[PDB]
Design a protein around this motif. Structure first.
Motif, PDB file in Angstrom:
ATOM      1  N   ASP D 215       0.868  -1.177   0.000  1.00 19.11           N
ATOM      2  CA  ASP D 215       0.000   0.000   0.000  1.00 19.11           C
ATOM      3  C   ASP D 215       0.906   1.228   0.000  1.00 19.11           C
ATOM      4  O   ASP D 215       1.783   1.365   0.857  1.00 19.11           O
ATOM      5  CB  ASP D 215      -0.955  -0.008   1.207  1.00 19.11           C
ATOM      6  N   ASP D 216       0.705   2.101  -0.984  1.00 20.56           N
ATOM      7  CA  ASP D 216       1.673   3.151  -1.281  1.00 20.56           C
ATOM      8  C   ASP D 216       1.681   4.297  -0.265  1.00 20.56           C
ATOM      9  O   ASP D 216       2.402   5.279  -0.444  1.00 20.56           O
ATOM     10  CB  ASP D 216       1.433   3.701  -2.698  1.00 20.56           C
ATOM     11  N   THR D 217       0.872   4.186   0.786  1.00 18.49           N
ATOM     12  CA  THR D 217       0.989   5.098   1.919  1.00 18.49           C
ATOM     13  C   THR D 217       2.397   5.015   2.503  1.00 18.49           C
ATOM     14  O   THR D 217       2.925   6.003   3.013  1.00 18.49           O
ATOM     15  CB  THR D 217      -0.055   4.795   3.013  1.00 18.49           C
ATOM     16  N   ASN D 243      -3.835   1.419  -5.633  1.00 14.97           N
ATOM     17  CA  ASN D 243      -3.122   2.150  -4.589  1.00 14.97           C
ATOM     18  C   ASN D 243      -1.962   1.345  -3.996  1.00 14.97           C
ATOM     19  O   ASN D 243      -1.554   1.579  -2.858  1.00 14.97           O
ATOM     20  CB  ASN D 243      -4.097   2.571  -3.489  1.00 14.97           C
TER      21      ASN D 243
HETATM   22 CA   LIG Z   1      -3.085   3.759   1.655  1.00 15.50          CA
END
Ligand SMILES: [Ca+2]
Ligand SMILES: [Ca+2]
Ligand SMILES: [Ca+2]
Ligand SMILES: [Ca+2]
Ligand SMILES: [Ca+2]
Ligand SMILES: [Cl-]
Ligand SMILES: [Cl-]
Ligand SMILES: [Cl-]
Ligand SMILES: [Cl-]
Ligand SMILES: [Cl-]
Lengths: 321, 321, 321, 321, 321
Positions: D215-217, D243
């Motif tokens: 998850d690219d967070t 995402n």
């Molecule tokens: Ca995220």
């Protein structure tokens, strides 16, 4: 609304294993099929009866097969070989006793095919981890009991498929409109007591071990008002399903016991049994192959004569699915 | 609205049993198929005719099979062996007579396969307990008769499946627009009498034993205006279905009797027959295999000549899906 | 709207019977399959051509089979045995000729399998009772003909299934945009005449016997304006279907006749043929197996050369679903 | 929303080929079935383990087959022959290593049948031309490897069908609710890190080569906060799916490694494995035949004892439809 | 909207026939299957290549079969026998050449089974009467060619079924994004020319004979701006389909020719090929069995080296449903 008690069991597992012994060798050797009936004794030790259709023995090999079978003190009746495997004759007796001891675990009819034993169980998901852990703890080097399935309950009837039973299954419904005549768990007639029941073991010897689903309007003491029940008053509270309290209980009735001992004395048995009590009426539900059906008239004749005050009807006999 | 009289029968059962006799031994031993035709006499005692297709005898074992068959005084005609089993040769004659005596019980065509006899019956649910009880009582005398099914009526046509008849079944419809020329139960032409009828026994000897469903606008005396009916005027009131009164009745007509007597003399018979009377018109419905179809022209020729004033049509002959 | 003339026939029957004769014995004895082509002569006597695929003869038994076949003056061509069988032209009993004489009766292709002949017929329901009665009367003369089906017309294509033809069937459509060059029934080009046509017999010898469905805008005299038609001007009015007048008629055309005689001289034939005439255009529809397809080119070559002014197209050849 | 990491692979191919060697000869000659497990070493060279069911050897030719197998230094255990094909014994080791080197390529379980090798791969369409080109270039050096399929990903489960595995496949789900006790890639517990993972090679030796969908967070350094991960910190950025950032990565965990080495020491392996991490929980998904199931208890016992701080559950074992 | 050029062909026919020759005798005698590849020469005379799978030869009869095959100068490669039937050895060469000469006729892959040859063709309905007439005229010269089907186009893929090909068929898609580097029909890059193309003959020798469907925005001179095309500039205008002009054309490209000669030199071929040109991109579509797939890498390697300026991709390889 809860009809079949099967609905309280949200989980199911298919246990598998092998124990080496001459019965296993011939089973694998000649593509035989055994039905395996779990039985518990008063100390809750699990054993098995083995059932073999005589007409399923390949005639080419009858001599060798019969000589192996006769070493196990078989009883032959109604075209069926019945063999008892006591705790000693049955090495796997200690793990299965452990599984049984897990409160919500219900044993279904098992089988042996290709030398491998299959045993379905139904239970409530809170007990899943306990079951898995005892399977893992049990694991040693060499042959171990394992899982071919564990997850949501596919239904009591999936158990029949899991054990590779190809025979037509039938549903028998009996009704008893005056069970209070037997007293015991049926003694209380003024309170609108309602429950469902299924045994944790299909067969048993001088013991009771039931799952009761009791409408939570009432408690166990409301049921046990006299001393005429079979077994003991003890229970273990398992939890709730909707408006029903779930108990493991060590008391039962003599009529169901009588039917069980008569039918196994004829080398026949049911695949599954459960019962319903409501509005002062008792319902008995049997799931069986045709062998059991042939003997129903005789079994009910016997049951009526041993319980002459009881009104007993056949509601219906239907083939299944 | 009531069309087929089958609709008044809300219940059905499949009786199964075994009797020891050489015919049973060869059937099981060589995978033969018998059709078993129930027959009652004037004393309401049940017996059976046995039918065997000659071309279904495995040629290798014909010699042994024929020597067994010939001991039973067979009649061979139209490629069919016909054997009569009298009360003496047929031990089970007393339970089946008891079942028959239950008012609403209708016997369908039976069969024997794998040495086991299968006999479907249709009836009205008030009589269910009486049927079950005589089966259970019978089991207390030794008798091995049991139930492979009891519950809702799945239909007269389910009976064909229950007895494992694989042959194509056909529906024959006859109509008679002037039945009053036969008088008897058809004598009254002024009242809009309407009824349906089916025999409790597919074949019979010097007797009548019918279920009549009579539109309750009228009574039995409205039908019986003369003395030219066959059998006796007696009835037993069974109950109501919608706007129909249900009777067990001991009177009939000579035309249906004639057809039955001719066809069995040719070793053929129907699987089921019922009739409808309304608007002064008579309908006869037969369900049969092809053997009966081959002889329909001859049978109708004979019937016309013996009843020359009767106008008799074939409405339809259709295979059944 | 009426497309296929099959739509005017609301009834259908499957006749069944046995010929006592050596051809019958070998058919049953060696599991052979005959196609049976009904043919009429000028006196409306029904006979049959029998067709047998040479490659369907089991070689183990070829000798015996050929010796039986050769007694019937066979013609062998294109791998096919053709045999002419006349039973009715002389003796008293003449059942198929009697059925044919019933106005609306149309004979389809028959077959013989397992020693039994199957012959489908299509007709109009007013003639049902006449057909049934002659079958019953026929049984009084010894005759073993009976009905395996009588009721609604399931379609000309059900006939193929009824006679147990397993071969792929094909639909051939021919169109002729200038049929007026043949005169006769095509001579009138100014009136918007429209009709459908199907023969009562698939094959015939020096005669015509058709069912015509004529758009009731016109009458038979509107068609017959010259003397160049084949057969006779006579008709029998059968009745009405929608806006069509139905006739039995004894006139036809030479082109369809020519095709029929050429193809049977090659031991091939169609299962069914009908035609449509509208907007001065003629359509011919053939339903056949592959044998006929192989010879279509040759047959059309011959037909064109014998009718050189006629424009003749193949519209379509499609397998049937 | 991304559940199964299979969803990031939009492409799939079925590689096929032949290598000359005595194992191939007997496979083709006697209709044997091999499972072929791709394995990589630290230098990313592809090799194969070959698995053969002992009971699938025709007894007729056991002697010849065993003599060929024994030349390859086999290990026999749990009814299974395991054979290692090193780079030299396995000529095609050079092309498959090239395919593996293409970043998004994931090798599935392969098979040999009829002497032909089938190997499914899943990948991201970005790499399609590179795969095709190396197959074409590889061809130029000797033509053998080719494509039976290349296009959309039909699913990881299609791979089982592609390699003609007929055995029942099962899905096993394990959950670990406290993976942080292993540290490494599970050390960070304060950030809501979420990812999916699947190995590029089903088996490996002293190396890691994974596809992570993160998850690219967060980024890779958010995961790698200590030095206790297995392998190396290095990654190659592949791209984006929704995402999620897709990486090829050279670090892993010791628990999955342990399970892999224990099971292959027992001559069993999974067909596919992937894992999910979210909300501080680890999920392991295995797809296997029954052989693996028999050993799950022993394998989990071993895994628990080597990782005593880890809470490990079986969530589910289900047959696949 | 026109995608597959198959959409311009509204008609289809299945030609069938027999020619006597030792190859025909053995095919019928031993239930062999030949694929028959139509090939034309510069004078548009039709010939055939015959392909026989070596592993489909019954080992029992290999000696006799091989001795017959070797008389025809066979080439054996990749497990396939390839035999050329020149005009003289192939009597039927003159009717098929006539069919081919009909402008819109496209020959598909043929087969021979049970001694009978099956050849599907696709065409435009205006040419139906010409095709039918040459078949009928041909039958007047002795010729046994006939029609098993003629009507609407069921699809190019029905042809595979018509010829009784049981092998799995695959679709291969190639794309060339810079076809202008080959000049010829691809030289014009400034006009938005769009067309579809399919050969009238699957194989050919020193000639071109195509059906082009050209978006009618442009004309043939818009395409032919240089002299570097293969074949000749001549065309025959066939008609219109939607917004496309249909041409028979005698020019082509060298790349498709090269691929064809390389693959037949390996005794493999496609069942069908067509191409699409639009937005300066060329798409090639091949429908084939697995034999061709094995050799795709080599064929593309060869093709790339002979056309080093061309960018070639495999877009897709999919089995056909
Ligand atoms: Ca995220
Ligand atoms: Ca309550
Ligand atoms: Ca009324
Ligand atoms: Ca009109
Ligand atoms: Ca345009
Ligand atoms: Cl119970
Ligand atoms: Cl009746
Ligand atoms: Cl006609
Ligand atoms: Cl993983
Ligand atoms: Cl092309």
């Amino acid at each position: 609304v809860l009809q079949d008690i099967d609905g309280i069991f949200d989980s199911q597992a298919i246990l598998a294993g092998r124990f080496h012994n001459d019965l296993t060798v011939i089973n694998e050797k000649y593509d035989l099929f055994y039905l395996m009936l779990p039985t518990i004794n008063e100390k809750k030790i699990v054993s098995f009866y083995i059932f073999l259709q005589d007409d399923q023995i390949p005639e080419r090999h009858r001599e060798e097969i019969e000589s192996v079978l006769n070493k196990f003190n078989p009883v032959i009746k109604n075209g069926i070989w019945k063999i008892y495997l006591d705790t000693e004759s049955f090495k796997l007796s200690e793990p299965f006793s452990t599984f049984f001891g897990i409160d919500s675990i219900v044993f279904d009819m098992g089988s042996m095919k290709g030398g491998e034993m299959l045993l379905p169980v139904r239970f409530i998901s809170k007990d899943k981890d306990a079951l898995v852990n005892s399977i893992i703890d049990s694991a040693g080097y060499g042959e171990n009991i394992y899982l071919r399935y564990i997850g949501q309950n596919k239904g009591f009837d999936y158990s029949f498929i899991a054990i590779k039973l190809l025979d037509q299954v039938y549903k028998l419904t009996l009704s008893i409109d005056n069970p209070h005549v037997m007293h015991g768990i049926f003694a209380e007639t003024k309170k609108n007591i309602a429950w469902r029941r299924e045994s944790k073991a299909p067969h048993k010897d001088n013991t009771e071990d039931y799952i009761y689903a009791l409408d939570d309007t009432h408690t166990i003491p409301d049921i046990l008002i006299d001393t005429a029940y079979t077994g003991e008053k003890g229970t273990v509270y398992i939890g709730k399903h909707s408006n029903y309290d779930i108990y493991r209980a060590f008391f039962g009735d003599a009529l169901t016991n009588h039917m069980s001992s008569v039918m196994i004395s004829e080398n026949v048995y049911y695949l599954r049994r459960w019962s319903k009590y409501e509005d002062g009426k008792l319902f008995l539900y049997f799931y069986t192959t045709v062998d059991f059906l042939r003997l129903i008239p005789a079994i009910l004749d016997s049951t009526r004569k041993n319980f002459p005050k009881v009104n007993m009807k056949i509601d219906e006999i239907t083939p299944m699915a």
